[PDB]
Amino acid sequence: KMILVDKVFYEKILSVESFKENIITQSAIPKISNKEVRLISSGSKIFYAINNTSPHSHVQLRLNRFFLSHIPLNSAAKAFVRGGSYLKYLEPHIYGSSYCRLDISSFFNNISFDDVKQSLSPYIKDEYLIGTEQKLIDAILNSVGYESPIRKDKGMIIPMGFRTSPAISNIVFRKMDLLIQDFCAKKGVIYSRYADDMLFSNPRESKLLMSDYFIDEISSLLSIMGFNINQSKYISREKEISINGY
């Protein structure tokens, strides 16, 4: 049975006490303000950390525990999934004779919130949570989303370091997981993915993974939802590959 969260589900199991006042007073649940979010800097990357005292942290953690963990995923996603691991991400490529490794540039920053809403819509009932002002799905997205003060142009952004960002990334990228898996399998290539790192292996004797056609096709598939391939991290080799030490 597909999971379906409705108004009673949000009120009882998810909100519990974190948003009791906002649900009894019929006041709209507000956006995650800049006061609750601190901005750490790690090299060229910026990480967003929410304070634990805020109710947003509690609702996000319970959202991970009870809702996001029940939505089905694709078997090629070996990251942030129950039972997945890096070794499981490398294992299916032992049978391959040629190897190719691709990366996605700014995977979490390029996840459009519209795609997230379209992905999470079928699993959330189309009801009005608060009168006729705010919808249940919009309230949950308020729980998961954020607006970066550094970059106000993009508006809604899924930031790294949140409670729910990895699982939401996996759910939104299940579409491309399916598309790339179908393409690679019809080409005879074993495909697997760990976060933004995609690994392909050809067991037959062929130069398919070395041609520019394969990179062009993967880029064309990724372009559907707006992603790009990091050309600095593109690797192609025969008979052995040294992926980040392994």
């Binding site: 089905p72 995923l73 694709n74 078997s75 090629a76 049978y95 299940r174 399916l178 898996q181 179908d182 399998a185 019809k186 005879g188 067991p203 037959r204 004797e205």
Partner: protein, 738 residues
């Protein structure tokens, strides 16, 4: 070996299943068709697609994946040894090298080739079949010659016993003509026809003229080679023709395979579906015995050698069974050469395959292996116990009537060695179990020194639980604190009362709760008191007394063929008041048969019984100071232990509690003389106790939930164990069926 591994991803009920470590006999058990028939379907589909047969593709477990994969790893070490040798320059060896082993040795250099040759290497060949979303099929090896050769070298034979045909023996011929490699192609069928008609002719030509007339009459297809070989064999055989019929079919099949494969390098895989169907249990045991005899008679080792013994690898035999007899005989006869596979269901409904340990290093356990032990392999939930009293209690029909959940749990008594070499934890099996043991197996109390001492099994449990002595920090600190308290249990001394019968301040219930809390992760539950101590509790004493009244009022009879004169004479001789004990001893006795007595005799017996009941109640309430002493005396009299965990024999040997022992002896020799035969542990007093108790309470209350509540109140600890087991059973049933 023949097959190293089989891997199925996202097909039918399989999410990601890998089967390996195949032994010579593979026994498949579990709940029906939870993946057994699915595994058979997967193997059959792979071997049908190997031979380029147009068969329907399998369904996907979940449509959120684009493809489903079946990977077969063949063990080609022996074939490499066969062909790489210089002596065998035949055409078949040459073709096998050019197909299977080339394109993998060409890439190698001289050093690596030498290293592969000289080392004790194992060679594998992996073939993967991928089913895409649009029914297309892709192989990891694009050469059909490789697939056909692999099909030839490792043929798959499936024998179904339910739908077996006792008159269609075509698979026998299709098997024998293929197994032993005779090259009849060099022998021309033209030359053979002329040759045979030269010989079998009564007059040279007469048979030939008759056959030529027939052939001119009959329009026949050209003979296929397999038809030629089948004709050859079954003509040369002295016979074409051949429940028990199916057994003979299967037994001859296995005999033919094992005998014929000894000279060939073809190693078939044979899968049997319910070999025991329609078989008497002795017939199934004899079938396994005959298979093992054929297996071992052709077996050559460092000891058994001679003409007629081969070192050729045997075919791999899977068979899916539902009968404990087949499994018991396999385990007993095959020793270390068999594997038991358990099929169950995951959380999301997918199939889960486990390997149950069926190999025992204790030869005594192998010999004593019987039907009861082999039954546990089919158990949904096991409650391992220590004594016969536990089996008497937990198997009580009346008790299990009120708790249908516990009816699915099998109660088995296991010794320490038996538990050591049978338990699922050491077998890493997903058959959930609980080991019910008393707290006395960890700590033994000394009254003379007033000191607890630690049993070796407690030290073993501590050593198993202290795995954090070699690792980093996490939220396990409370466990370490509990283990520290367990360590401090040794040094502490505690004072006793009434010469070592009760504890002054200490509650063994708290320590038992702590032990259970700590050890629940090791699947062992430690009951605070013995089963006989759990039944005789302060809350159930009235009913216990009621039971005694019953065994006085209904189960007692008169020991004389003439009740009238007998009862009158002993009424005269012995006074009712001052000599009630000898009067009851002479008049009444426990007997299964209750002869009919007269109205006056019945009234006199009833009056004497009521007087004795009142006397016994008075004396029980008088001789013992409090109800706790009464409970303790009853527990010891049936073989129980005190709060200090001491038996009557232990006290007698040690010499403590002299007054209590003498009081109990007086009661057993004077007042409870009739209940003395039921004082033993094996007397079965538990069954009568529980039956009378449950019937009485059912007479008291008419609601099932209420009756369960009353039983829970009367036996808090036994019912607590039953309820915990039932909750775990429901949780694991939702783990399987939910």
């Amino acid at each position: 070996m023949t097959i190293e591994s089989i891997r199925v991803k996202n097909l039918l009920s399989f999410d990601d299943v890998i089967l390996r470590d195949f032994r010579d006999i593979n026994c498949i058990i579990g709940r029906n068709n939870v993946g057994k028939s699915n595994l058979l379907k997967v193997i059959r589909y792979f071997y049908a697609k190997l031979e380029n047969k147009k068969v329907i593709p399998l369904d996907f477990h979940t449509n959120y994946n684009a493809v489903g994969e079946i990977t077969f790893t063949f063990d080609t070490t022996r074939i490499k040894k066969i062909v790489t040798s210089r002596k065998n320059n035949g055409r078949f060896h040459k073709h096998i090298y050019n197909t299977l082993f080339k394109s993998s040795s060409v890439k190698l250099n001289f050093e690596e080739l030498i290293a592969r040759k000289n080392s004790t290497n194992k060679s594998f060949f992996s073939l993967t079949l991928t089913i895409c979303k649009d029914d297309s099929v892709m192989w990891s090896v694009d050469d059909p010659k490789v697939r056909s050769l692999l099909a030839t070298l490792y043929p798959f034979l499936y024998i179904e016993t339910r739908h077996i045909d006792l008159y269609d023996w075509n698979p026998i011929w299709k098997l024998i003509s293929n197994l032993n490699s005779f090259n009849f192609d060099d022998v021309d069928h033209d030359e053979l026809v002329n040759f045979l008609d030269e010989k079998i002719s009564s007059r040279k030509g007469d048979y030939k003229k008759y056959i030529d007339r027939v052939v001119s009459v009959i329009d026949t297809k050209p003979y296929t080679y397999k038809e030629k070989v089948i004709n050859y064999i079954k003509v040369a055989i002295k016979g074409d023709s051949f429940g028990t019929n199916s057994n003979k079919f299967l037994e001859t099949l296995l005999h033919l395979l094992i005998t014929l494969t000894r000279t060939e390098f073809i190693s078939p895989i044979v899968y049997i579906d319910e070999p025991e169907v329609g078989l008497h249990p002795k017939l199934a045991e004899s079938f396994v015995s005959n298979l093992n005899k054929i297996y071992s008679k052709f077996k050559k080792t460092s000891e058994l050698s001679g003409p007629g013994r081969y070192k050729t690898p045997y075919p791999n035999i899977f068979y899916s069974t539902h009968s404990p007899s087949i499994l018991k005989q396999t385990i007993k006869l095959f020793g270390k050469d068999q594997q038991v596979l358990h099929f169950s269901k995951k959380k999301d409904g997918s199939t889960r395959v486990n390997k149950i340990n069926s190999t025992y290093s204790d030869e005594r356990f192998l010999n004593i292996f019987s039907d009861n032990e082999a039954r546990l392999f089919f158990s949904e939930y096991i409650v391992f116990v220590e004594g016969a009293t536990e089996l008497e209690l937990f198997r009580n029909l009346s008790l299990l009537n009120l708790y249908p959940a516990f009816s699915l749990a099998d109660i088995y008594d296991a010794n320490e060695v038996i538990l050591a070499n049978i338990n699922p934890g050491y077998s890493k099996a997903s058959i959930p179990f609980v080991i019910i043991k008393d707290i006395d197996t960890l700590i033994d109390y000394s009254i003379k020194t007033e000191k607890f001492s630690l049993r070796p099994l407690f030290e073993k449990m501590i050593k198993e639980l202290t795995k954090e002595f070699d690792y980093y920090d996490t939220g396990f600190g409370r466990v370490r604190k509990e283990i520290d308290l367990f360590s401090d249990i040794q040094s502490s001394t505690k004072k006793h009362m009434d010469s070592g019968l009760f504890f002054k301040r200490f509650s063994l219930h708290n320590l038992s709760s702590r032990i259970n809390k700590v050890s629940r992760k090791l699947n062992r539950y430690f009951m605070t008191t013995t089963i006989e101590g759990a039944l005789i509790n302060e809350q159930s004493l009235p009913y216990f007394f009621n039971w005694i009244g019953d065994v006085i009022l209904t189960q007692m009879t008169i020991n004389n063929p003439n009740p009238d004169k007998f009862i009158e004479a002993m009424r005269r001789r012995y006074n009712i008041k001052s000599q009630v004990v000898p009067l009851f001893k002479s008049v009444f006795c426990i007997g299964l048969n209750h002869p009919v007595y007269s109205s006056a005799v019945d009234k006199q017996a009833l009056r004497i019984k009521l007087s004795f009941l009142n006397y016994l109640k008075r004396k029980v309430y008088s001789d013992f100071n409090n109800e706790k002493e009464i409970v303790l005396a009853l527990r010891l009299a049936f073989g129980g232990k005190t709060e200090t965990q001491y038996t009557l024999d232990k006290l007698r040997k040690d010499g403590e509690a002299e007054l209590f022992r003498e009081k109990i002896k007086n009661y057993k020799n004077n007042e409870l003389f009739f209940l003395e035969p039921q004082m033993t542990k094996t007397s079965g007093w538990v069954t009568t106790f529980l039956n009378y108790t449950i019937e009485k309470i059912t007479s008291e209350e008419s609601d099932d939930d209420r009756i369960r509540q009353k039983l829970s109140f009367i036996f808090p600890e036994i019912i607590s164990i039953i309820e915990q087991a039932s909750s775990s059973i429901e949780a694991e049933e939702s783990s399987l069926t939910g």
